[PDB]
Amino acid sequence: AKLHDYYKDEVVKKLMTEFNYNSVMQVPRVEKITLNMGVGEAIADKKLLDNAAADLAAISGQKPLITKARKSVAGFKIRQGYPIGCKVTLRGERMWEFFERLITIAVPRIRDFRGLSAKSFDGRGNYSMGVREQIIFPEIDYDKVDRVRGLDITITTTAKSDEEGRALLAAFDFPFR
Amino acid sequence: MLQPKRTKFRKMHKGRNRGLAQGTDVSFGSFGLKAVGRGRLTARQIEAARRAMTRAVKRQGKIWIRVFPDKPITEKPLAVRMGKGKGNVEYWVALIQPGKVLYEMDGVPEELAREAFKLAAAKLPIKTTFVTKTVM
Amino acid sequence: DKKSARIRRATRARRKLQELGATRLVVHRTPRHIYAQVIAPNGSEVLVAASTVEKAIAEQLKYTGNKDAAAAVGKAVAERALEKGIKDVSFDRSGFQYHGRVQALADAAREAGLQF
Amino acid sequence: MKKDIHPKYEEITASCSCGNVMKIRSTVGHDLNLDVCSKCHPFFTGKQRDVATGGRVDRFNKRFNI
Amino acid sequence: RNGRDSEAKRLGVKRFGGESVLAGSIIVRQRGTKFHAGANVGCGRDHTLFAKADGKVKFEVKGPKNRKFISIEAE
Amino acid sequence: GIREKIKLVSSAGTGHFYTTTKNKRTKPEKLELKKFDPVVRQHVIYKEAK
RNA sequence: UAGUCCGGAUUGGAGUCUGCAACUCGACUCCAUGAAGUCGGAAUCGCUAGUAAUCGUGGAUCAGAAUGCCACGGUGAAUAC
RNA sequence: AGCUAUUUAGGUAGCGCCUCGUGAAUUCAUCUCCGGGGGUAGAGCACUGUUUCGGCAAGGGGGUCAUCCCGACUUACCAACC
RNA sequence: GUGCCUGGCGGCCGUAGCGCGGUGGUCCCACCUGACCCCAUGCCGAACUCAGAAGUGAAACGCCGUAGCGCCGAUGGUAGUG
RNA sequence: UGGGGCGGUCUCCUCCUAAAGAGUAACGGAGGAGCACGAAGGUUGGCUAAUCCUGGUCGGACAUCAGGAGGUUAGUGCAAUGGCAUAAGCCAGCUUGACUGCGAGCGUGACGGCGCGAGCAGGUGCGAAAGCAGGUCAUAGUGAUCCGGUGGUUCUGAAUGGAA
RNA sequence: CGCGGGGUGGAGCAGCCUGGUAGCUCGUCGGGCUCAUAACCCGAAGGUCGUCGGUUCAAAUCCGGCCCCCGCAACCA
RNA sequence: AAAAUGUUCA
């Protein structure tokens, strides 16, 4: 959570002279991050979902929410109301605890790293990336898993334009290409 | 032969055909064929009349057909007693009111079109007259 | 939206009270100040109003944004209403969950004579 | 943060090939001995030492030798 | 085949504007809430608006979405 | 249909009962409702029967 | 006792030699990569002794190029009512 | 010479309609004024459907192929959505 | 004498609502700082909630200008009709 | 019964026909019901869509995630119509009013019958409380009488006391 | 006109009924046995259910429209 | 127990 302290001094001043904001409240703040972990194959086995939820509980610092089917899909054979995904919304200190724990610990452990994409912005200053292997988080001791647990990390900020969300992460030296 | 692609209901009430038409003024082409007599144009009559004028101009210009059938006229089988269900749909007519612009043309001279609509009118049942697009 | 969400929450309670011809005790909670005004059954004219913006209340407090501040406010609305002779009244949460500051205001009014 | 459902939070310690005295909170309940961090990044200069293709003339000149 | 139909429910407005009603008298037998309850009227479970107080019928159009209400004056 | 009728008999000092139905093929237990007992004028427990 | 330090196909790079010349189309070496394959369906084949089976060596043609062919020896059975 | 029910449809029963007796409220009717709810005729096309042309236009069919990963071009021409 | 401000509650329900541009923070309002506890998340101080108030007028809200739209809408004629 | 036979239909609910109150026919045009629920009921508190576009591991047009547009084109146990955000739509906590005895006053039927119902007495539960609740958003999910069965109540019980 | 049932690998038949999976014999392809063929033995492939529209999360299946086919009725003067 | 066939000329 020391990166939050980084924000309060380093980031804000580096940003007010970068886009020329007339107010300190107009610079972007990182709202929240959502660690979604789509399991999908939970219909094949219920404890497949339990193994999935346990690993996601390790990644974050809290118990995730078992999301279900919004609508019934026959393409993937799921009725209206079947648990198929697991998400958790880090907000506040633990959000910062996680944000820093990703950029200084996790990404360096990504096999064949070459930098992230600056095109992963939806268009509202909100960044959304996707890790393939969850193994880059030291929580999993490697010798307890059996599935390639992939999870998406989507950051929502208060930025009004996607390019403003970009330079926000440039303040934290968020690795790209 | 125009026919509604997948209509809402299969059969329909007979109804009456009253009042003056709506498409009175010519709005697409330069010349038109406005109806004067009341009546109903079946799909086969609109189809036949179109060929009559498409040959008159050889193939050229634009021929707008501002009227569409969209009204299934049913019919019983030959020699059957009355009642026991409504008839089966046979053809599709289009109720025409006086002052209705049936066709519209453009690109050809007035003499050619007044001659083209002459052929067209000989195929239609309702007494039709020639009209032109005026400003406003 | 925080505001309008709260307002459509208040409508049900308000429509029911404005059709029973009941005098209502409404309360608007804000981060810094609490409002309490009593409205007649016709709906346009109020009878008794008392909030933390009034000097006669604001002066004797420490900060106008806590339970005890409202506890004094609830006390005042029952005292001013009784010089008007208003004993039976009805309560409106006005979109606020009856839990903290609003709850403090209410019981202070109940123990002050205003029976609602 | 309702209790009894979320795992523990201890201030864990992390090391690096750079000798990073890194103390971050996590739910491990161990002591992590890591190789790479943001201070011993193989990326920042790894880009220029990644692409070196687009040359065969000097490569070919080692065979002509003159 | 066709030929099946239901027997009429005799709905509609039983008492019109200005009529003197008695408490408990049915004003309108609507189906849904075509007519909302105004003042001194109750909405039954059949959605039947009746008079909760004997008086005079008063049709009005109030509300932000402009709906019809049937009120009754204390006559 | 599949829903057969049961007789909710009181556990009080009377032979009064309420009649209702029950989905025999989804509910293994007996119905338990604290209903009014129109004799001793109080609310008692009505366990089901046939 | 494991797709295992089994297995070696395949492929990228880097070389040596023969030969005017190795791209189509050689052999071999080095590093890396490292699949199929866990005793094989119906059916079928060789052999009775230093043979079967197994291991390694040489020769012819040949500039170079065989796991083929011709030839030699080491180890060395079982069974034939 | 209507409604409702009827092993009922050319019968019958109750109500409606006729007549006689008796008792009662300007009670009832026509008209002007006032208070009403309607949603039909007509009209309209935001809605549920349907229709034509024009513009934009994914998407599309067939061609020419690089006739390999990629993709491009063209078109006898079909076409949603706003 | 009052006027411009602002918050709440209603009347009236688009001539009142959208859009565009500007603008206000001493007050009021909002955001906001913090959260061991009251209380809450089918995960999370997002919301709910409490404790407080540095900072800000960005968002939101309010006010003004603007008709680009929604909206309101004659007179006359026409349709319909007793 | 557009002669009879054959085919079909017979009760109930929704729309149209139906001519702007109600009602209104045909072997006229379209569809459905013969149940379901212990919660899908009661209540308190809270929440509010469908479909597209952008980004994101497996993952594709569509699984789950975040954001935007949008606006109820969604949903409501079932057909259709009417209705619904104060939501009647969606989630959770707590319970049984899916309550007994009545019921001013009207609606609708020839009648049998059917429907709505403020309020009163008893007792219950939800909410701090105002109040709310005697089934379910409404309209279908149903059959008279006789005869006979089971339980309760001493009302009766052919001489009296019992009993059938 | 009217009525019942049916169409599914190349051929002839199951599966529908109670929706989520398409089986059966022959034929067919490859190997084997034989001097060669048949027969026999081993292994595998091959059908989006006539078609169109809708219903549901989902259509071989449910509903409706149409075609081909088979059977049935076309009686009373 | 099963156990069929073999184009014409030369």
For residue A46, what are the contacts with CB-CB under 8 A and spacing of at least 6?
Answer: none
For residue B5, being part of any structural domain is answered with: no
A 10 A CB-CB count for E6 gives 5
For residue E4, being part of any structural domain is answered with: no
CB F35 within 8 A of CB F8: yes
Select from A6, A62, A109, A143 the residue whose CB has the most chain D CBs within 10 Å, as the one to mutate to test that interface: A62
For residue E35, being part of any structural domain is answered with: yes
Q: One-letter amino acid identity for C28?
A: H
Distances (CA, A) of C66 to C35, C51, C52, C78, E66: 12, 13, 11, 19, 41
Query: Is residue A104 less than 8 Å (CB to CB) from chain D?
Result: yes
Q: Tell me the shortest Cα–Cα distance from A79 to chain D, in angstroms.
A: 29
**CATH code of the domain in which F37 resides:** 2.20.28.120
Distances (CA, A) of A136 to A131, A151, C4, D46: 9, 11, 44, 20
Sign of the torsion formed by the C-alpha atoms of D20, D24, D28 and D30: positive
Distances (CA, A) of B66 to B22, B28, B33, E25, E63: 11, 9, 10, 56, 45
For residue E3, being part of any structural domain is answered with: no
3-state secondary structure B89-135: EEEEEEEECCCEEEEEEECCCHHHHHHHHHHHHCCCCCCEEEEECCC
CB C49 within 8 A of CB C37: yes
For residue E18, being part of any structural domain is answered with: yes
- Give the domains, in start order, of chain A with CATH numbers: 1-177 (3.30.1440.10)
Residues in chain E: 75
For residue A93, what are the contacts with CB-CB under 8 A and spacing of at least 6?
Answer: A1, A4
Give the bases of strand J that a protein CB approaches within 7 Å.
1-3, 7-17, 21-24, 26-32, 34-38, 45-48, 50-51, 54-68, 81-88, 95-101, 104-109, 115-118, 122-124, 128-131, 134-139, 151-153
- The shares of helix, strand and coil residues in chain E, as percent rounded to the nearest 5, are 0, 45, 55
- Structure token digits, residue C20: 């029973």
Q: How far apart are CA B25 and CA B28, in angstroms?
A: 10
Q: Judge residue B16's burial from the number of C-beta atoms within 10 Å of its C-beta, 0-12 exposed, 13-18 middle, 19 or more buried.
A: exposed
CB A53 within 8 A of CB A85: no
Q: B113 is in which domain, residue-wise?
A: 21-136
User: Is strand K in 7 Å reach of the CB of B85?
Assistant: no
For residue B31, being part of any structural domain is answered with: yes
- β strands within chain F, DSSP E: 4-10, 17-22, 32-37, 42-47
- Structure token digits, residue E5: 């139909």
CB A123 within 8 A of CB A159: no
CB E57 within 8 A of CB E18: yes
Q: What's the number of domains chain E is made of?
A: 1
Q: Name the CA radius of gyration of chain A, rounded.
A: 18
- Structure token digits, residue C82: 């009784």
Q: E36 is in which domain, residue-wise?
A: 11-75
Q: How far apart are CA F30 and CA F9, in angstroms?
A: 11
DSSP designation for E3: -
Q: One-letter amino acid identity for E26?
A: I
Q: Which residue has the tokens 């209702």?
A: F20
User: Is strand K in 7 Å reach of the CB of A80?
Assistant: yes
Q: What's the number of domains chain C is made of?
A: 1
Experimental method: cryo-EM
Q: Name the CA radius of gyration of chain D, rounded.
A: 23
For residue B29, being part of any structural domain is answered with: yes
**CATH code of the domain in which B95 resides:** 3.90.1170.10
- Structure token digits, residue F50: 């046939």
Using CA coordinates, name the residue in chain D closest to A100. D24
CB B117 within 8 A of CB B25: no
Say whether A138 and D9 touch across the interface (CB within 8 A): no
Residue E54 half-sphere exposure toward CB, CA atoms < 13 A: 2
- β strands within A69-127, DSSP E: 83-87, 89-90
For residue B14, being part of any structural domain is answered with: no
Sign of the torsion formed by the C-alpha atoms of C51, C57, C59 and C61: negative
Q: Closest nucleotide (CA of B70 to C1')? A: H50
Q: How far apart are CA A12 and CA A16, in angstroms?
A: 6
The runs of H, that is alpha helices, within chain A are 2-6, 12-16, 46-59, 93-101, 162-171
- Structure token digits, residue A115: 């930098």
D39 neighbourhood in chain A, CB within 8 Å = 104
Q: What's the number of domains chain B is made of?
A: 1
CB C66 within 8 A of CB C74: no
Resolution as reported, in Å: 3.2
Comparing every residue's Cα with the C1' atom of nucleotide I78, the nearest one is B20
